[PDB]
Amino acid sequence: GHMEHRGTDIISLSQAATKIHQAQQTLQSTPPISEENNDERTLARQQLTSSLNALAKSGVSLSAEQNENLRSAFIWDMVSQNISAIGDSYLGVYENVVAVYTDFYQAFSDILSKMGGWLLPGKDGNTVKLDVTSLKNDLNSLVNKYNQINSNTVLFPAQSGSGVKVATEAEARQWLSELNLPNSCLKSYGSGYVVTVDLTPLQKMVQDIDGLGAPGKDSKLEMDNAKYQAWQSGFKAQEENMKTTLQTLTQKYSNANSLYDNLVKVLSSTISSSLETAKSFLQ
Numbered sequence: 001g002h003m004e005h006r007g008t009d010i011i012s013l014s015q016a017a018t019k020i021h022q023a024q025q026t027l028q029s030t031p032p033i034s035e036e037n038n039d040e041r042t043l044a045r046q047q048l049t050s051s052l053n054a055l056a057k058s059g060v061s062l063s064a065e066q067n068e069n070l071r072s073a074f075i076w077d078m079v080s081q082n083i084s085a086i087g088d089s090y091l092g093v094y095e096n097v098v099a100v101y102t103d104f105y106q107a108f109s110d111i112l113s114k115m116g117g118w119l120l121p122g123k124d125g126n127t128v129k130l131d132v133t134s135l136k137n138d139l140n141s142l143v144n145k146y147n148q149i150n151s152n153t154v155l156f157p158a159q160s161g162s163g164v165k166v167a168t169e170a171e172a173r174q175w176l177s178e179l180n181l182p183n184s185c186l187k188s189y190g191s192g193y194v195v196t197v198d199l200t201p202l203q204k205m206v207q208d209i210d211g212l213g214a215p216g217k218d219s220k221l222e223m224d225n226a227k228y229q230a231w232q233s234g235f236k237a238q239e240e241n242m243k244t245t246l247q248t249l250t251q252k253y254s255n256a257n258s259l260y261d262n263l264v265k266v267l268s269s270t271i272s273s274s275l276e277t278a279k280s281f282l283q
């Protein structure tokens with residue numbers, strides 16, 4: 001127990017520092033906006049935990065101060081276990097939530113991009129014509145698409161290659177609460193439950209469109225500028241509800257990512273302190 005081996009300690013600790021820094025760089029720079037991106041982020045965490053498993057076997061020893069910093073923040077196999085669970089069951093869920101919501105929101109944006117063409121000149125300068133039918137049909141089609149249960153719609157659990165992965169009612173309700181989503185997002189499927197995208201603003205938009213009254217023979221609705229403007233304000237309010245939902249989720253994702261990163265910093269600080277120790281010697 002008297003044979004020192006600074007050289008090999010320095011090599012092992014530097015190897016771990018490097019792998020952790022690379023994973024951290026990926027998790028800080030790669031947005032969770034596509035399946036490809038989240039595959040890269042998941043692989044980065046796999047790389048980080050493999051590095052800790054390797055470090056655990058290396059023979060590097062920790063001080064009493066370091067052992068304690070680690071126990072409290074989260075021995076090396078306990079650390080790897082705890083960080084693995086958070087990456088998989090907390091951050092990985094949030095990544096899925098953002099990627100699914102991103103593509104849903106894009107589908108909505110694509111509809112909004114058509115609205116210019118659905119607003120026509122009226123009979124005079126005090127009236128407009130809104131193509132209420134084309135707008136309602138496109139919104140309804142979106143609702144129908146995202147009311148299904150599949151990999152395009154399910155926020156939790158994150159889905160794999162086959163079937164529909166479901167959770168117990170209690171597990172799904174916990175995430176519903178965690179995400180601050182309305183009750184309508186909680187759905188039974190087969191043997192359990194999933195949490196899906198919020199369709200309420202879309203459904204309200206359609207209601208408010210029918211609220212305007214029946215279209216004319218052309219399938220469109222003539223309206224005075226005041227009525228149109230009042231309708232548009234209400235429509236924009238529903239767009240703001242969807243924007244707000246997405247904002248809450250992306251912020252919550254960022255904070256989940258920051259919580260993991262804070263644990264990564266603890267790892268990096270621990271390893272840097274060991275490296276100092278391996279390089280240091282009392283006069």
Ligand code: NI
Pocket residue numbers: 001002003
């Ligand atoms: Ni010895």
